[PDB]
């Protein structure tokens, strides 16, 4: 079905642009490269790995 | 070209019809409400000029598309509430009902319902 | 200093450290990175003692196994900015495959056209889930190097 | 570049059409950025937005010959820069809105 894959697509394209702004901030050294970024990405990681890859 | 992209064959395919319905409903209200001139209750002879064949075919085509992506009784309820709520552009409403009656499957009786209520 | 590689200092203090070798790469002249090639593991303690005496007071040392935390954060982000691109490509390739009285008659035809796009190729989904699986593998590797640190 | 260095395009950093190698251009941006004390991202952004202005000006809504070819080779280099994390998106967007007229 399709509603399904769009729900996933939207939930992904928020995290994608979130990461992209985070990468720009690391480019311009705006925040830091220390931590809380590390702890943020390891939160986005956890979020994806729970129902990773239903294979049908 | 604007009405062409508006025609939801390329768009309805990709877009979930939760926000797309809100888009079309807001679009209908924003067509009806905007520039409520010729509010003259003496807009009686102008019904002949707002006859379906005289109303521009572009208006007609857009209304067809808005009828495609939505349901009839939803539209009738929405119209009842809007015409009760707020001012009208009579040109668009009268052209709109003229296209509505012929386009949807026998909703002249669903019209006469809320006519009797009003 | 060694001239040929000025990033290498060799200690010539004639007691216990002689033949130690260090390198100092500074970055944001707050932060910096010290690497001690020493001749046993005692001599690396006697050095980190002697030093943490002569730094300023809030100097926050830390051992690194697998590269400086900045580098790992890039290497983490890269493998998420690849994965989430691939999971977009999934839905986009899918959304190509879905596209591939007079008024009442045309009304019903166009309604039938819009009810056709409920379905998606399982085979294609599968092709994409192998492309994704490949990047998940790279991301999860790069997350274990980070969560140790 | 007028203040620190005495009296900008990819031609500037690469020095008068030497080569078109992606790694070579990366090392040129590193050298330039080392001189100016600016992060490499913002140099990349500025140079790319300038070269985009150039391409889109040199002759209307569409541009569909040879413009597209130069543009795709340039954007193929932008993707290299993005993958090596040598590109501020937001500095790029700002430097395009500074153009705001040349763009199609």
How far, in Å, CA of C24 to CA of C35, rounded?
Answer: 7
Q: Which residues of C touch D (CB under 8 A)?
A: 74, 77-78
Residue of A nearest to D87 (CA): A27
**C117 at B interface, C-beta within 8 A:** yes
What letters, b where the CB count within 10 A reaches 16 and e where it falls short, cover C2-27?
A: eeeeeeeeebeeeeebeebebeeeee
Using CB atoms, which residue from B13, B68, B99 is nearest to C110?
Answer: B68
* Nearest chain C CA: its distance from B100 CA (Å): 10
Give the mutation candidate from A27, A30, A33, A37 for the D interface (greatest D CB count, under 10 A): A27
* Nearest chain D CA: its distance from A18 CA (Å): 13
**Beta pairing partners, C23:** C35
**Dihedral angle, C-alpha B11, B15, B17, B23, nearest 10 °:** -70
C97 three-class SS: helix
How far, in Å, CA of D103 to CA of C10, rounded?
Answer: 56
C36 three-class SS: strand
Identify whether the C-beta of residue B72 lies closer than 8 Å to the C-beta of residue B107.
yes
Residue of C nearest to B67 (CA): C107
Q: Which of C32, C21, C31, C24 is nearest to C7 (CA)?
A: C24
Joined together, the tokens standing for residue C81 give: 């900015």
Q: Which of C22, C25, C19 is nearest to C8 (CA)?
A: C22
Structural resolution in Å: 4.2
Q: Which of C99, C97, C100 is nearest to C123 (CA)?
A: C97
- Is residue B87 left, alpha or beta, with left meaning phi > 0 and alpha meaning psi from -120 to 50? beta
How far, in Å, CA of B96 to CA of B75, rounded?
Answer: 11
**A27 at C interface, C-beta within 8 A:** no
Joined together, the tokens standing for residue C142 give: 């790069």
CB contact under 8 A, C77 and D83: no
Largest CA distance in chain A: 43
C22 three-class SS: strand
* Distant-in-sequence contacts of A13-21, Cβ < 8 A, 24+ apart: A13/C84, A13/C88, A15/A44, A15/A47, A15/A48, A15/C80, A15/C84, A16/C81, A16/C84, A16/C85, A16/C88, A18/A44, A19/A44, A19/C77, A19/C80, A19/C81, A19/C84, A20/C81, A20/D89, A21/D89, A21/D90
Q: Tokens 């768009």 correspond to what residue? A: B11
Residue of A nearest to C117 (CA): A2
Q: Which of B3, A50, A20 is nearest to C81 (CA)?
A: A20
Q: Which of C131, C146, C26 is nearest to C74 (CA)?
A: C146
The DSSP result for C64-90, as a single string, is -SSS-HHHHHHHHHHHHHHHHHHHHHH
* Nearest chain D CA: its distance from A26 CA (Å): 9
What letters, b where the CB count within 10 A reaches 16 and e where it falls short, cover C58-74?
A: eeeeeeeeeebbbebbb
How far, in Å, CA of C81 to CA of C138, rounded?
Answer: 12
How far, in Å, CA of D75 to CA of D87, rounded?
Answer: 12
The DSSP result for B19-83, as a single string, is HHHHHHHHHHHHHHHSS-----S--STHHHHTSTTTS-HHHHHHHHHHHHHS-HHHHHHHHHHHH
Neighbours of A30 (CB within 10 A): 11
Sign of CA dihedral C53, C55, C60, C61: negative
Q: Which chain B positions have a beta carbon within 8 Å of C104's beta carbon?
A: 102-105
**C112 at B interface, C-beta within 8 A:** no
Q: How many residues does the structure list for chain B?
A: 118
How far, in Å, CA of B31 to CA of D96, rounded?
Answer: 35
CB contact under 8 A, B13 and C117: yes
Using CB atoms, which residue from B8, B69, B102 is nearest to C103?
Answer: B102
How far, in Å, CA of B73 to CA of B92, rounded?
Answer: 19
The experimental method behind these coordinates is cryo-EM
Q: Which of A26, A53, A12 is nearest to C75 (CA)?
A: A26
How far, in Å, CA of B80 to CA of C56, rounded?
Answer: 76
Please calculate the CA angle C106-C111-C115 and round it to the nearest 5 degrees: 150
Q: Which of C85, C15, C64 is nearest to C43 (CA)?
A: C15
Q: Pairing state of beta strands C9-10 and C32-37?
A: unpaired
Joined together, the tokens standing for residue D62 give: 């569409």
CB contact under 8 A, A16 and C70: no
Joined together, the tokens standing for residue A15 give: 């995290």
How far, in Å, CA of D59 to CA of D72, rounded?
Answer: 17
DSSP code of B105? S
Joined together, the tokens standing for residue C65 give: 């196994």
C130 three-class SS: helix
* Nearest chain D CA: its distance from C3 CA (Å): 22
Neighbours of D18 (CB within 10 A): 12
How far, in Å, CA of B14 to CA of C91, rounded?
Answer: 10
**C55 at A interface, C-beta within 8 A:** no
């Amino acid at each position: 079905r399709v509603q399904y894959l769009r729900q996933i697509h939207a939930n992904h394209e928020t995290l994608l642009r979130e990461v992209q702004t985070l990468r720009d901030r690391l480019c311009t050294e705006d925040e830091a490269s220390s931590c809380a970024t590390a702890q943020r990405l390891l939160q986005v990681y956890r979020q994806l790995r729970h129902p990773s890859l239903i294979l049908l | 070209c604007w009405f062409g992209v508006f025609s939801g064959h390329t768009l309805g395919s990709v877009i979930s019809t939760d926000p797309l319905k809100r888009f079309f409903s807001h679009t209908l209200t924003q067509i009806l409400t905007h520039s409520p001139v010729l509010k003259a209750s003496d807009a009686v002879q102008m019904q002949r000029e707002w006859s379906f064949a005289r109303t521009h075919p572009l208006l007609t085509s857009l209304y067809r598309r808005l009828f495609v992506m939505l349901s009839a009784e939803e539209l009738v309820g929405h119209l009842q509430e809007v015409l009760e709520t707020q001012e009208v552009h009579w040109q668009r409403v009268l052209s709109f009902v003229s296209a509505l009656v012929v386009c949807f499957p026998e909703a002249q009786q669903l019209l006469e319902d809320w006519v009797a209520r009003l | 200093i060694i001239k040929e590689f000025p990033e290498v200092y060799f200690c010539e203090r004639p007691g216990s450290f002689y033949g130690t070798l260090f390198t100092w790469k500074q970055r944001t002249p707050f932060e910096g990175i010290l690497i001690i090639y020493s001749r046993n593991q005692t001599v690396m303690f006697q050095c980190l003692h002697n030093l943490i005496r002569i730094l300023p007071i809030n100097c926050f040392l830390k051992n690194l196994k697998s590269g400086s935390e900045n580098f790992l954060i890039d290497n983490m982000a890269f493998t998420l900015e690849k994965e989430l691109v691939t999971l977009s490509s999934l839905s986009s390739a899918i959304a190509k495959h879905e596209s591939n009285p007079y008024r009442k008659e045309l009304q019903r035809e166009k309604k039938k056209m819009l009810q056709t796009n409920l379905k998606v190729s399982g085979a294609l989904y599968r092709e994409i889930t192998l492309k994704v699986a490949e990047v998940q593998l790279k991301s999860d590797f790069a997350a274990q190097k980070l969560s140790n640190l | 570049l007028l203040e620190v260095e005495g009296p900008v395009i990819d031609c500037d950093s690469s020095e008068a059409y030497a080569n078109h190698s992606s790694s070579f251009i990366g090392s040129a941006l590193q050298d330039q950025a080392s001189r100016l004390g600016v992060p490499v991202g913002i140099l990349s952004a500025g140079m790319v937005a300038s070269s985009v202005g150039q391409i889109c000006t040199a002759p209307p809504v569409l541009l569909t010959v040879e413009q597209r070819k130069k543009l795709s080779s340039l954007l193929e280099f932008a993707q290299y820069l993005l993958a090596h994390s040598m590109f501020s998106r937001l500095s790029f967007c700002q430097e395009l809105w500074k153009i705001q007229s040349s763009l199609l």
